[PDB]
Enzyme design. Structure first.
Site, short mmCIF file in Angstrom:
data_model
loop_
_atom_site.label_atom_id
_atom_site.label_comp_id
_atom_site.label_asym_id
_atom_site.label_seq_id
_atom_site.Cartn_x
_atom_site.Cartn_y
_atom_site.Cartn_z
CD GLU A 127 -113.70 -21.17 26.92
OE1 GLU A 127 -114.72 -21.49 27.49
OE2 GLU A 127 -112.76 -20.59 27.64
CG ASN A 168 -108.81 -16.91 23.41
OD1 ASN A 168 -107.59 -17.20 23.27
ND2 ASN A 168 -109.36 -16.92 24.64
CG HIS A 204 -106.18 -22.26 30.63
ND1 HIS A 204 -105.82 -21.45 31.72
CD2 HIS A 204 -107.11 -21.61 29.96
CE1 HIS A 204 -106.35 -20.30 31.56
NE2 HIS A 204 -107.08 -20.42 30.59
CD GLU A 232 -107.60 -17.26 28.53
OE1 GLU A 232 -107.95 -18.18 29.34
OE2 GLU A 232 -108.37 -16.92 27.40
CG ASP A 234 -103.08 -21.67 33.62
OD1 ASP A 234 -103.30 -22.62 32.98
OD2 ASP A 234 -103.93 -20.90 34.05
O1 LIG Z 1 -114.47 -22.60 31.20
C1 LIG Z 1 -113.53 -22.99 30.71
C2 LIG Z 1 -112.79 -24.17 31.62
O2 LIG Z 1 -113.77 -25.34 31.73
C3 LIG Z 1 -111.31 -24.59 30.87
O3 LIG Z 1 -110.73 -25.65 31.28
C4 LIG Z 1 -110.42 -26.78 30.43
C5 LIG Z 1 -111.32 -28.16 30.57
O4 LIG Z 1 -110.77 -29.18 29.77
C6 LIG Z 1 -109.10 -29.19 30.50
O5 LIG Z 1 -108.72 -30.49 29.92
C7 LIG Z 1 -108.24 -28.05 30.35
O6 LIG Z 1 -106.84 -28.48 30.74
C8 LIG Z 1 -109.01 -26.99 30.95
O7 LIG Z 1 -108.30 -25.80 30.49
O8 LIG Z 1 -110.62 -23.55 30.53
C9 LIG Z 1 -111.05 -22.37 29.69
C10 LIG Z 1 -112.33 -21.77 30.73
O9 LIG Z 1 -112.92 -20.81 29.90
O1 LIG Z 2 -111.56 -15.08 37.72
C1 LIG Z 2 -111.91 -15.94 36.81
C2 LIG Z 2 -111.14 -15.44 35.62
O2 LIG Z 2 -109.62 -15.53 35.71
C3 LIG Z 2 -111.66 -16.80 34.50
O3 LIG Z 2 -110.95 -16.51 33.17
C4 LIG Z 2 -111.35 -17.45 32.33
C5 LIG Z 2 -110.17 -18.70 32.16
O4 LIG Z 2 -110.72 -19.33 30.92
C6 LIG Z 2 -110.49 -18.70 29.64
O5 LIG Z 2 -110.81 -19.59 28.68
C7 LIG Z 2 -111.47 -17.38 29.95
O6 LIG Z 2 -111.53 -16.94 28.55
C8 LIG Z 2 -111.25 -16.48 31.03
O7 LIG Z 2 -112.13 -15.29 30.99
O8 LIG Z 2 -112.94 -16.62 34.25
C9 LIG Z 2 -113.69 -16.95 35.37
C10 LIG Z 2 -113.43 -15.67 36.54
O9 LIG Z 2 -114.01 -15.98 37.85
#
Ligand SMILES: O[C@@H]1[C@@H](O)[C@H](O[C@@H]2CO[C@@H](O)[C@H](O)[C@H]2O)OC[C@H]1O
Ligand SMILES: O[C@@H]1[C@@H](O)[C@H](O[C@@H]2CO[C@@H](O)[C@H](O)[C@H]2O)OC[C@H]1O
Ligand SMILES: [Zn+2]
Ligand SMILES: [Zn+2]
Ligand SMILES: [Zn+2]
Ligand SMILES: [Zn+2]
Ligand SMILES: [Zn+2]
Length: 312
Positions: A127, A168, A204, A232, A234
Site C-alpha cells: 500500500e 501489494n 478486498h 487477499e 473477500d
Molecule cells: O488499512 C487498509 C484498509 O483501509 C483497506 O480498505 C480499503 C479502503 O477503501 C475501500 O474502498 C476498499 O474496499 C477497502 O478494502 O484494505 C487494506 C488495508 O490494509
Molecule cells: O487481523 C487483522 C489482519 O487480518 C489485517 O490484514 C490486513 C488487511 O488489509 C491488507 O491490505 C493488509 O496487507 C493486511 O495485513 O491487518 C490488521 C489486523 O488487525
C-alpha cells in the site's frame, strides 16, 4: 469431491487462505484450512511490529509456527509483508531520517534471510499509493523519498534470489488512477533493472461492485512481464445476509476467479481467511461482513459453489 486447492492446481494455479496464530486452536477451522487449500499466507505475525519489536532484535517465533503448519500439509506459503506504513512498531518513527533507509534494508535482509527457501512469494512493499495515484506519505516515503520502494526490492532480492518479489496494494483491481500508478512503477522498474516479479491485487471487494475491467487490468500487468495474484480476496456486503446478497456475492466470486483463469500469468488466489467467523471485515467496515465463502458455522455458501464451478 475435489477441493478448491486441487481444482486450482489442476489448472496450474494455487488457491489458498491467509490465517493467524490465535485461530489455530480451533480444530474444525484448522482441519479445513489444512485440507481445502494448497497455499497459505501468514496473516499478521510476519509484520514488522511482530518480527522486529525493538530495533535490531528480531522475532520469528509466531510466523514460524504458521510456516511449519503449512509445510506439514504440503502447502506453499506467501510472506506478508516487509515494508508497510501500518502495524509498524513505534521505534521506527523515532529513527533519525538519515538512518531509516539503512534500517529498512536491515529489517528486510533479516526476515528474508531467515525464511529463505521456504516461501514462494514475499509482499515486499504494501500500500504505497493513495487513491489518486500519488505516493502515500508514510514514514518511508517522507524520510527516504521515492526510491524507498526500489531499495526495498533490491534488498529483498539480495537476501533471497529465488523467491518471487511482489508489490501489494488494494483498489488496484480495475483500470484507474491507482492501478495506473502501479503500472507505471512496474514499467519503470523493468526498464531500470529493479527486481520485481509480480503485483498483488488484494481484491478486498464490495458485493455488486466488482471492477468490470478486472481482467484487462490483470492482462496488461502480465504483458509487462510480471505475474499477478489476488492476494487477499473477500467480497463484503452490508449486513444482514439475504439470499439475494449471497447470490450476488457468488456471481462476483465466479467472475473474479474466471478473470484470473483467463490470464496465463495470474498464478493464484488467496482469500483473506476463509470463514466469516474470523474475517477482519466487521472490525474495519462497520455494518459490513459475510465476505467469505464459508459462514461463521463453517457452512459453505453459494459463493463456494461459484468458485468451484469457475475452477471447474
Ligand atoms: O488499512 C487498509 C484498509 O483501509 C483497506 O480498505 C480499503 C479502503 O477503501 C475501500 O474502498 C476498499 O474496499 C477497502 O478494502 O484494505 C487494506 C488495508 O490494509
Ligand atoms: O487481523 C487483522 C489482519 O487480518 C489485517 O490484514 C490486513 C488487511 O488489509 C491488507 O491490505 C493488509 O496487507 C493486511 O495485513 O491487518 C490488521 C489486523 O488487525
Ligand atoms: Zn516472541
Ligand atoms: Zn520450524
Ligand atoms: Zn488509466
Ligand atoms: Zn450458516
Ligand atoms: Zn453447490
Amino acid at each position: 469431491t475435489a477441493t478448491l486447492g486441487e481444482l486450482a492446481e489442476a489448472k496450474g494455479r494455487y488457491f489458498g487462505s491467509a490465517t493467524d496464530n490465535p485461530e489455530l486452536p480451533d480444530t474444525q477451522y484448522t482441519q479445513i484450512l489444512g485440507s481445502e487449500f494448497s497455499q497459505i499466507t501468514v496473516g499478521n505475525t510476519m509484520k514488522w511490529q511482530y518480527t522486529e519489536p525493538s530495533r535490531g532484535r528480531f522475532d520469528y517465533t509466531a510466523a514460524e509456527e504458521i510456516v511449519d503448519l503449512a509445510e506439514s500439509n504440503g502447502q506453499s506459503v506467501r510472506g506478508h509483508t516487509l515494508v508497510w506504513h501500518n502495524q509498524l512498531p513505534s521505534w521506527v518513527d523515532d529513527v533519525p531520517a538519515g538512518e531509516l533507509l539503512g534500517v529498512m534494508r536491515d529489517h528486510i535482509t533479516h526476515e528474508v534471510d531467515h525464511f529463505k527457501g521456504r516461501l514462494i512469494h514475499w509482499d515486499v512493499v504494501n500500500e504505497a499509493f493513495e487513491e489518486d495515484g500519488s505516493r502515500r506519505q508514510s514514514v518511508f516515503q517522507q524520510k527516504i523519498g521515492d526510491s524507498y520502494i526500489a531499495e526495498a526490492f533490491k534488498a529483498a532480492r539480495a537476501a533471497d534470489p529465488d523467491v518471487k518479489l511482489y508489490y501489494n496494494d488494494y483498489n488496484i483491481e480495475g483500470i484507474g488512477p491507482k492501478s495506473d500508478a502501479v503500472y507505471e512503477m512496474v514499467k519503470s522498474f523493468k526498464a531500470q533493472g529493479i527486481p520485481i516479479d509480480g503485483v498483488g491485487m488484494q481484491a478486498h471487494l464490495i458485493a455488486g461492485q466488482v471492477p468490470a475491467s478486472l481482467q484487462e487490468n490483470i492482462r496488461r500487468f502480465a504483458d509487462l512481464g510480471v505475474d499477478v495474484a489476488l492476494t487477499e480476496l473477500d467480497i463484503r456486503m452490508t449486513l444482514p445476509r439475504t439470499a439475494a446478497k449471497d447470490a450476488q456475492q457468488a456471481t462476483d466470486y465466479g467472475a473474479v476467479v474466471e478473470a484470473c483463469l483467463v490470464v496465463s500469468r495470474c498464478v493464484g488466489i488467496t482469500v483473506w481467511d476463509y470463514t466469516d467467523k474470523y474475517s477482519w471485515v466487521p472490525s474495519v467496515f462497520p455494518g459490513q461482513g459475510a465476505a467469505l465463502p464459508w459462514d461463521e458455522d463453517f457452512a459453505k455458501k453459494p459463493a463456494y459453489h461459484a468458485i468451484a464451478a469457475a475452477l471447474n
